[PDB]
């Protein structure tokens, strides 16, 4: 019966949650750690990744 | 000033190396020109300079 309210929650739970998995994607670079990208490159092409 | 070949690649923004870290620095946001002529008649003596 309390789908509605439920629905609700676990939507945004889930939003919330798909926007911190995002954290761990590389988006087309070399790692999601700016610390690795920091640590493992140089600055100038620390700055394009 | 004057730098040997091999390091003349090292007259530019995000560069690394002995020159670029402990002699001459061009900064990241570095706007300007970098010009360098071999000079092997005016720098370069039979003895060594």
Known sequence: ?49 | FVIRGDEVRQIAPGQTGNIADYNYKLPDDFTGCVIAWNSNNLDSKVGGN
């Not at chain 1, 790692?31 to 990744?49: C, G, M």
């Open chain 1, 1 to 49: 019966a309390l789908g509605k309210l439920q629905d609700v929650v676990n939507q945004n739970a889930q939003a919330l949650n798909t926007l911190v998995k995002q954290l761990s994607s590389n988006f087309g670079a070399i790692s999601s750690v700016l610390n690795d990208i920091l640590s493992r490159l140089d600055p100038p092409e620390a700055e394009v990744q």
